[PDB]
Amino acid sequence: KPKKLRFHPKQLYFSARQGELQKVLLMLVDGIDPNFKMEHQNKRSPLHAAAEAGHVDICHMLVQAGANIDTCSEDQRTPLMEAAENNHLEAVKYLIKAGALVDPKDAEGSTCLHLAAKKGHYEVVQYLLSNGQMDVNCQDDGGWTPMIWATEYKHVDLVKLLLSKGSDINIRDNEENICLHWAAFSGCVDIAEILLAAKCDLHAVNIHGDSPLHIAARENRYDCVVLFLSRDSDVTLKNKEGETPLQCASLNSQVWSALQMSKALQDS
């Protein structure tokens, strides 16, 4: 039973993280369980660290040793999600081609597609939609789609990629917002333009009665406000509290100056 060269269980996780291929090889040969879970470190397996860092050589060695490709951390994350969120395409490709499940959702109901969309990783999203049977309109616990996340973080070519692969411009979230309300929130005039060309309703309202113009004025997104005014968005429409988009704007601001002008000019 006594071994001259002894390893600590935690050493396999950190060596997978650092991409020390020869150290992982030696530990796996010494019969260290590749399916170990880090107790005081969000119950993650070394396959999570190897995937998070993008080490395809290490990832493969762990799977060949017998690691579970679909292991979950405390926050119900899979290594496929860790590689997708940290933009490691060849690790994403390795895990999908090994048999990693694309379908799992984390604690927030996010899939690897949501997590790569959120961060603007075009390359990963492109692979997940092409060499994957992944739902373009999957919704998380807020009822948000990968497009909504991509829109909010202003990832224009990513929104365009999802649009071209069947993303529905009319999906409603749990607060009754469509993607256009999030383009108005983020202040993305490029995305807001693309959605309007796709003949999106400029007067769609959420659970608060807010039109994209209410949201753009509140978030002080002048460029969006101007786009919506040029598309003849209603300056009079009152939300649920009874406020017009002008009543949502910041006092003595560029948005305020434009909205107070539009109101006086439409009067007659």
Side-chain angles (χ1 to χ4, degrees), residues 47-55 57 59-62 64-68 70-73 75 77-95 98-102 104 106-117 120-130 132 134-153 155-168 170 172-185 187-193 195-198:
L47 190 50
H48 285 118
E52 175 166 66
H55 304 312
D57 51 342
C59 281
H60 182 55
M61 195 156 44
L62 290 165
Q64 282 213 289
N68 172 18
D70 301 297
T71 183
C72 281
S73 68
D75 317 320
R77 315 245 288 193
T78 57
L80 175 55
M81 283 163 59
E82 286 296 315
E85 203 190 54
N86 289 275
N87 198 38
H88 299 306
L89 185 54
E90 300 310 312
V92 167
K93 278 196 161 190
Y94 171 71
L95 294 176
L101 311 166
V102 291
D106 58 34
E108 308 271 49
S110 299
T111 71
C112 55
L113 182 60
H114 279 111
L115 296 183
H121 303 326
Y122 182 102
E123 292 74 19
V124 167
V125 176
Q126 190 185 38
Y127 178 74
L128 293 175
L129 294 170
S130 55
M134 277 212 90
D135 186 3
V136 213
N137 299 306
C138 58
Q139 300 166 88
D140 55 23
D141 289 352
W144 301 305
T145 72
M147 183 169 279
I148 283 176
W149 281 100
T151 300
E152 190 189 335
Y153 288 93
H155 301 302
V156 186
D157 285 335
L158 195 53
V159 157
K160 296 221 271 183
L161 173 77
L162 298 162
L163 278 164
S164 80
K165 302 301 162 192
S167 187
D168 189 356
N170 297 326
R172 290 266 174 167
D173 77 5
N174 299 355
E175 279 210 323
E176 305 166 17
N177 295 286
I178 43 157
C179 212
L180 192 61
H181 294 114
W182 295 105
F185 184 85
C188 197
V189 193
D190 289 22
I191 291 163
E193 202 153 40
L195 294 160
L196 284 171

Side-chain angles (χ1 to χ4, degrees), residues 180-185 192 196 201-206 209-231 233-237 239 244-249 255 258 262:
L180 192 61
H181 294 114
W182 295 105
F185 184 85
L196 284 171
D201 196 9
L202 183 70
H203 299 102
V205 294
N206 65 21
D210 284 336
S211 70
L213 189 59
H214 280 84
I215 295 161
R218 193 176 283 117
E219 291 315 297
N220 221 56
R221 314 296 177 184
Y222 187 76
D223 308 300
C224 276
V225 163
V226 163
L227 165 69
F228 305 148
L229 297 167
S230 75
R231 298 308 167 90
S233 183
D234 195 11
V235 176
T236 75
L237 179 63
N239 58 20
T244 54
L246 162 84
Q247 288 169 258
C248 304
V255 164
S262 208

